[PDB]
């Protein structure tokens, strides 16, 4: 019921091997949509889910020029980052820009989003007031000071209140499908014997979106949140996702234990054992 | 300069059934810089043609790309991934074990 | 949709 719109860009140089790679992808959730990559043979921003398909030949070519002009800027960038960090010419360096909002299920803006990182690290960032800026060193504050004399923060305040929230919204309407539901997880456990002293108790969360999730294990009520192993929420490869959460138990004792499930799909939380 | 080494998880889509196709992935997450390459093998040879998503980062900036392809799970045949990265010394590779 | 416009860092 609430919902995000994110533009994600990394431009990478590679002195001696042309213009730096740029590639963009924008999400709804965690739904691709589309997606631009600087090195496909005459590159266009392209649809990725069923319903942007429906915007007409001028959508895409508005994107696709906007697409092809962040490249050319980040690519000036690039050579300006050189300047600013007194940087050689000679490695590959890295620009990353994201920008968004998130809605309330009435559909308001609840916040915007508009920052960079060089080289994996935090650059300069709009405030979450979309007036002021967080410059993350003395480079970045040159960049703060040219984007307070041009009034950027203004410009993207607009952009983000306006056009931002009423395309999300416009997105949301047209693929309500899949992106107002919320598949819950399919879980059990299973039992994996270490030795005849323990054995590792998994509790598994598979085929759930969104990737919001929560899977935890008690002994006797009591949270094992030093002894269990969370692996990282991983994408299935058909719009959903995976989890598992695993626990060393001795034997015998495995009825101490239950799995707890939060997710947005599911009526209830659930509680799980082992049943042999 | 800050490099991350990245995470590797190699799973299949469905659970597994010997003799039923499925897909086979290899997650790659957590790094930085972004480039890195990556490798599905069948019983330690390249898997032609696998395809990959295109990069995108998480909140902290670091990449993440999937890697992918068709396949059909026997008990037998071995299944891997192999993953190199400026971080690494040599190329990780991660072998696939279907209960996890 | 993306926006428009953009300013050099
Ligand atoms: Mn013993």
């Not at chain 1, 300047?83 to 360096?93: F, K, T």
């Not at chain 1, 309330?104 to 960079?116: C, S």
């Not at chain 1, 006797?220 to 989890?243: I, N, W």
């Not at chain 2, 299944?79 to 190199?84: D, E, F, G």
Request: aromatic share 12%.
């Amino acid at each position: 019921g609430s919902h995000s719109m994110r533009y994600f860009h990394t431009s990478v140089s590679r002195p001696g091997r042309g213009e730096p790679r740029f590639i963009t992808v924008g999400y709804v959730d965690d739904t691709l949509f589309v997606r631009f990559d600087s090195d496909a043979a005459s590159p266009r921003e392209e649809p990725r889910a069923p319903w942007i398909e429906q915007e007409g030949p001028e959508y895409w070519d508005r994107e696709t020029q906007i697409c092809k002009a962040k490249a050319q800027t980040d690519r000036e960038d690039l050579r300006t980052l050189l300047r600013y960090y007194n940087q050689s010419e000679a490695g590959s360096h890295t620009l990353q820009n994201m920008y968004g909002c998130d809605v309330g299920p009435d559909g308001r803006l609840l916040r915007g989003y508009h920052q960079h990182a060089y080289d994996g690290k935090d650059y300069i960032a709009l405030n979450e007031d979309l007036s002021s800026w967080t410059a993350a060193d003395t480079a970045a504050q040159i960049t703060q000071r040219k984007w307070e004399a041009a009034r950027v923060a203004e410009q993207l305040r607009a952009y983000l209140e306006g056009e931002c929230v009423e395309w999300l919204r416009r997105y949301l309407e047209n693929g309500k499908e899949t992106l107002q539901r919320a598949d819950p997880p399919k879980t059990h456990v299973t039992h994996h014997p270490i030795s005849d002293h323990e054995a590792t108790l998994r509790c598994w969360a598979l085929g759930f979106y969104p990737a919001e999730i929560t899977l935890t294990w008690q002994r006797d009520g009591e949270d094992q949140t030093q002894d269990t192993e969370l692996v990282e929420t991983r994408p299935a490869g058909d719009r959903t996702f995976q989890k598992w959460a695993a626990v060393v138990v001795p034997s015998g004792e495995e009825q101490r234990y239950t799995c707890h499930v939060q997710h947005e799909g599911l009526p209830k939380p659930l509680t799980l054992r082992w049943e042999p | 300069m800050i490099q991350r080494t990245p995470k590797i998880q190699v799973y299949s889509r469905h659970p597994a059934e010997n003799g039923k196709s499925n897909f086979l992935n290899c997650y790659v997450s957590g790094f930085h810089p972004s480039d890195i390459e990556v490798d599905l093998l069948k019983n330690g040879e390249r898997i032609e043609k696998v395809e990959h998503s295109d990069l995108s980062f998480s909140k902290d900036w670091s990449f993440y790309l999937l890697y992918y392809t068709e396949f059909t799970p026997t008990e037998k045949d071995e299944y891997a991934c192999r993953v190199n990265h400026v971080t690494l010394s040599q190329p990780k590779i991660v072998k696939w074990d279907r209960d996890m | 949709r993306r926006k428009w416009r953009r300013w050099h860092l």
